[PDB]
Structure 1
């Protein structure tokens, strides 16, 4: 008989899951498995992203229970768990979504060898990304395109991505009963308190495939907005109803299939001939994800500066004081501090909000390495993606892809163009709630009487600005100009 395991790592969903469809085919028993490291926090990860994963697994558990099955959260490392459960469950086939991250390739290689020793067939379909990323490289002459414009001409020569896979059957072959490694008390989904966290999650975005689909349909309720979407024209100060889809955490964990997203976009585009085109369109945003995935998977040391063949080597400063002030939202610039407060509270900010804080920390003001800001983003972001977080930090620091280091966002003027009353600022920084809008972006310019009437004295309730933007930015520009000249 055929007994199979569908191993969840990403792809935390039942829709468009070719690995699950293959695991169920002609199977007598199916073991849906997620491997959890109970010593993860005793190693970096916020409760917001880890609870988002737990809610995603809880959503999987209900979906499996609704089809006569059950999700098994096995404790331990995969190289030690699978050799046992291969023999105990009589497994003949192992199925999991292909992953191109560096750690994934080492882990998957090791598991593949253990599977061959136990006589277990391994099927690893591609469905995290739109395309087979190795096929795009092979189609482009053996090297990944380094520009979005050339990357778009490649995907247009390849054609549409594969259709989303059909849904699994209404009933699924259940796990075998009374197997010791499948005991319910040792395979349940843990809560955020049980994995070690002490502070509760504060984010407003709930995890799981069900939430991902409901947010997808909400984005498509207005097909004209989808068709006319232009990323650079969206509002970073909008928080009550964010100006973009906020599908990034679900695409990161695979709660939403990118191919389903892409297939829905094409339906709307066929009916609205004036729809926006890449790179600004909503399809263009999925292409940025694919573009960065294709470059980064074929570039060694992509997440670092040294040894990265595509990253500029810049003499970033080792200023721990500037980094701590930026990390703890006490720079003295309310627009910067409000975004960094949203980072720790929600785990998600609008793309241009991330532009503001990343330019400020790196090539704009503090001249700290993009790797340091990256480490802070990887801790709190619920959409934390190894390749996207890398490439966008190298973009914002003018270390890769982007080179116009003379374009420097003002931490005073940028948000003021969207939100002159500072509603975004008062939301996330309630200490400035009573500050009049004339000084909300520049509280140190307010007279002492106004600061006292609003109960926010600069240097007592809210910190004074750590740098003068006009002085700091001119220095960063002069130094970036020399870094782009000394190289060749």
Structure 2
């Protein structure tokens, strides 16, 4: 009990399995939560309507959970460097708790806020919550960060795994006197999506909120997971969890997700299952690899990390970029993926690799243009993972690899052999023959209004290799 402790939420929108929140409840029952609508983020051109819609639904639930627990979630709108210390001063808060992040913006903001709180004589405690292992814990024998997945995985996998922490209960709300002291800093109501200027009708991979995310984890683990491998390969198959946005925003705790995978892996008697489960567990490790990477090498966010890739002579033809964004490339597998993206705010992972390779190696456009278009549409848009996926398409950052220019055709054959996914997103081509949809060779008569390939794959492959080889001669 005692004076109030403020817990500042940002990307951990849940009451359960929250490290910082659990640590705070151990210090006082007068635990008040807050979320600050930050214009520097919400007004950025990098916002996606699906993503704000998801965020807004998570906050609605969180307001309720706090009310049910005994206190409330305070809502502010403005610059946190200014509003957080002021709010804490007015409430003479004993401390302000929050969970650390890996993003440059987040880390700079947090330092300023912490500095301001100290100046005010108020304690700020920042703990690690969104990762099973913090960036400081996973280092090589020489005490250096990993820039290659292999060694990172062997280390990460051998570390003892933490257990989910308890959900705080029996909280005590603020008094009328305290509410009066802060009234001028508060928002009276959670704004609606239209009030923020966004609209979204495309649905979600998982419904917003802590309850839904938890329900989905349980469900994925009682059935799906067992078949993860190889079901995750096929875009037509609903083989993945659909939890990506819940993990981006912390609607589900990472220790709860790992624990569920552990349990499922033990109850499983089939060796095939035990494998699908271990494959999903590695996907959680890829997530941390990319988050630790941005933490250790922040410059990654600025563009190509490897020097030569910084000098690459991208062609950058706007006309090709536009057709890409509009799903008018003429390459079925590609256009189908781009339609799923813009219509639903989500895209199967195999398709993200395919459209990324396409933009970088076929269209020869600086991948940063693609990185930004993705952030503007993805419900799970996440700087670390998106930047990691795009650097991947060019081997310009972490975990590099030898050149390999994909053939959309081949990929289609491999992952959409029957063209089910393609026709799902390109109905105007339902009449066409799989063989044709996979190959991309459609007769002008049965293919309709649908465009012809905007580029010739083989001519593009040579062009790219040529630009790449010329360059290698001056590095």
Per the normalisation by structure 1, the TM-score is 0.88
Structure 2 equivalent of residue 464 of structure 1: 452
Which has the higher relative contact order, 1 or 2, with Cα contacts under 8 A spaced 6 or more apart?
2
Q: Does 1:253 align with 2:245?
A: no
The correspondence for 2:289, drawn from 282, 288, 291, is 291
SS at match of 1:281: helix
Q: Within 5 Å, which residues of 2 pair with 1:97-176?
A: 97-137=99-139, 140-157=141-158, 159-169=159-169, 171-176=170-175
Structure 2 equivalent of residue 9 of structure 1: 10
SS at match of 2:138: helix
SS at match of 2:338: helix
How far does residue 99 in structure 1 lie from its aligned partner after superposition?
1.1
How far does residue 28 in structure 1 lie from its aligned partner after superposition?
5.5
The correspondence for 2:374, drawn from 362, 373, 377, is 377
How far does residue 438 in structure 1 lie from its aligned partner after superposition?
4.4
Contact 2:29 2:171 in 1 (8 A): no
1:424-447 superposed Cα distances (whole Å, 9 cap, x missing partner): 223222322333444334666325
Distance 1:327 1:16 in 2: 39
Distance 2:439 2:157 in 1: 47
Q: Within 5 Å, which residues of 2 pair with 1:369-408?
A: 369-400=366-397, 401-406=399-404, 408=405
Structure 1 equivalent of residue 94 of structure 2: 92
1:130-171 superposed Cα distances (whole Å, 9 cap, x missing partner): 11211213x5422111222111222244x22221111212x2
Distance 2:144 2:11 in 1: 26
Give the ranges of 4+ consecutive aligned residues of structure 1 lying more than 4 Å apart after TM superposition: 182-185, 275-280, 306-313, 441-444
Q: Within 5 Å, which residues of 2 pair with 1:7-406?
A: 7-27=8-28, 29-38=30-39, 40-41=42-43, 44-137=46-139, 140-157=141-158, 159-169=159-169, 171-177=170-176, 179-180=179-180, 181-182=182-183, 186-197=187-198, 199-205=199-205, 206-222=207-223, 226=225, 229-230=228-229, 234-238=232-236, 242-272=238-268, 274=271, 281-305=279-303, 313-363=311-361, 365-400=362-397, 401-406=399-404
Q: Would you say how many aligned residue pairs link Structure 1 and Structure 2?
A: 467
How far does residue 37 in structure 1 lie from its aligned partner after superposition?
2.6
1:431-487 superposed Cα distances (whole Å, 9 cap, x missing partner): 223334443346663252xx2xxxx52xxx22221011122223223433444x336
Contact 1:72 1:188 in 2 (8 A): no
Distance 1:97 1:176 in 2: 26
How far does residue 83 in structure 1 lie from its aligned partner after superposition?
2.6
Distance 1:217 1:325 in 2: 40
Flag the 1:249–1:112 CA change in 2: closer, same or farther, 3 A: same
Q: Which has the higher helix share?
A: 2
Distance 1:76 1:196 in 2: 16
Distance 1:252 1:346 in 2: 17
How far does residue 36 in structure 1 lie from its aligned partner after superposition?
0.2
Contact 2:3 2:93 in 1 (8 A): yes
Contact 1:51 1:201 in 2 (8 A): no
Distance 1:376 1:446 in 2: 31
* Segment of structure 1 superposing worse, 178-187 or 147-156: 178-187
Contact 1:279 1:285 in 2 (8 A): no
How far does residue 78 in structure 1 lie from its aligned partner after superposition?
0.3
1:376-416 superposed Cα distances (whole Å, 9 cap, x missing partner): 1111111111111111211112323242323x332234224
Report the RMSD for the aligned CA atoms in angstroms: 2.7
Distance 2:256 2:21 in 1: 16
Flag the 1:35–1:443 CA change in 2: closer, same or farther, 3 A: same
How far does residue 54 in structure 1 lie from its aligned partner after superposition?
0.3
Flag the 1:105–1:278 CA change in 2: closer, same or farther, 3 A: farther
Distance 2:303 2:66 in 1: 43
Q: Does 1:477 align with 2:465?
A: yes
How far does residue 73 in structure 1 lie from its aligned partner after superposition?
1.8
Name stretches of at least 5 consecutive residues in structure 1 with no aligned partner.
Answer: none
Contact 2:45 2:376 in 1 (8 A): no
Distance 1:189 1:125 in 2: 27
Name stretches of at least 5 consecutive residues in structure 2 with no aligned partner.
Answer: none
Distance 1:349 1:211 in 2: 20
Flag the 1:80–1:308 CA change in 2: closer, same or farther, 3 A: farther
Distance 1:280 1:319 in 2: 42
Flag the 1:175–1:23 CA change in 2: closer, same or farther, 3 A: farther
Distance 1:370 1:466 in 2: 18
Flag the 1:367–1:92 CA change in 2: closer, same or farther, 3 A: same
How far does residue 32 in structure 1 lie from its aligned partner after superposition?
0.8
Contact 2:31 2:173 in 1 (8 A): yes
1:42-69 superposed Cα distances (whole Å, 9 cap, x missing partner): 7631211111100111111121122232
Flag the 1:11–1:4 CA change in 2: closer, same or farther, 3 A: same
Distance 2:443 2:234 in 1: 25
Structure 2 equivalent of residue 410 of structure 1: 407
